[PDB]
Amino acid sequence: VGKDAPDFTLQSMDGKEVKLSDFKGKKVYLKFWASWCGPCKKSMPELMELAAKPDRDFEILTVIAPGIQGEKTVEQFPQWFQEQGYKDIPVLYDTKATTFQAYQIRSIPTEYLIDSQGKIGKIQFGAISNADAEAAFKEMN
C-alpha cells in the first residue's frame, strides 16, 4: 500500500499551527515550492483556481523553507506573497527545512497527493494541472 506521508507540525503564514495528520479523513494536495522558483510561481494562479472550486474533497497545503536556499525570511515573505497578487493559498513555514528533508525534496515545485488515510498516492515533479490532480484524487480513498 501507499507509503505513509511523513507527518509535520508547522506554523502557517497566518499564524495557525498546521499538522498533517489532523487532516486524516480528507485528501491532501501538498506542494513544496520557493519564491525564487519561476515554474513554482507559474503554477500559483492555477492553484488559486483550484482553491476556489467549492466541491473539493481535498485540502491544499503549500510549504516553503524561509531564509533557506534563497527563500525570503518570515519577516518578508507574507508581504511578497500579497504583492504578487496571490491569495487563498495556505503557506507553511518549514523553518529548519526538516519537512523538505523528510519528503526527500531535491527539486521544486514538487506535489505530493495524499489520500484520506495519510498515504502517498502520487508524487509529481514540476507541473500538474487541476484536471490531473482531480483525476488522481478520484481514484484515492
Numbering used by the authors: 45 to 185
The authors write:
In addition, the molecular interplay of the surface-exposed TlpA (renamed Etrx1) with its extracellular paralogue Etrx2 on oxidative stress resistance and virulence are unknown. This study discovers the unique molecular architecture of two surface-exposed thioredoxin-systems, Etrx1 and Etrx2 and their redox partners CcdA1, CcdA2 and SpMsrAB2 as important pneumococcal extracellular reducing systems essential for pneumococcal pathogenesis and oxidative stress resistance. The bioinformatic analysis of pneumococcal genomes identified two genes encoding surface-exposed thioredoxin-like lipoproteins, renamed here Etrx1 and Etrx2. According to the accepted catalytic mechanism of thioredoxin-like proteins, Etrx1/Etrx2 would bind their redox partner SpMsrAB2 by means of a hydrophobic surface and subsequently perform a nucleophilic attack on the target disulphide bond via the N-terminal nucleophilic thiolate of the CXXC motif (Cys84 in Etrx1, Cys81 in Etrx2). Surface-exposed Etrx1 and Etrx2 deliver electrons to the SpMsrAB2 protein for the reduction of MsrA2 (by Etrx1 or Etrx2) and MsrB2 (by Etrx2) domains.
Attempts to obtain the reduced form of Etrx2 by co-crystallization with β-mercaptoethanol resulted in a new oxidized structure in which Etrx2 forms a complex with a 2-hydroxyethyl disulfide (HED) molecule. A different conformation of the β4–α3 loop was observed coupled with the presence of the HED molecule at the hydrophobic cavity. Etrx2 has an unprecedented hydrophobic cavity close to the active site. The presence of a hydrophobic patch near the active site has been associated with substrate recognition in other TDORs. In the structure of the oxidized forms of Etrx2, a detergent molecule (Cyclofos-3™) or a HED molecule is bound to this hydrophobic pocket, very likely mimicking the redox partner interaction. The CXXC motif (81CGPC84) defines the active site. Many thioredoxin-like proteins share also a proline residue within the CXXC motif. This proline residue is also present in the CXXC motif of Etrx2, but not in Etrx1. The Etrx2 binding site presents a hydrophobic character while Etrx1 presents a highly basic character in this region.
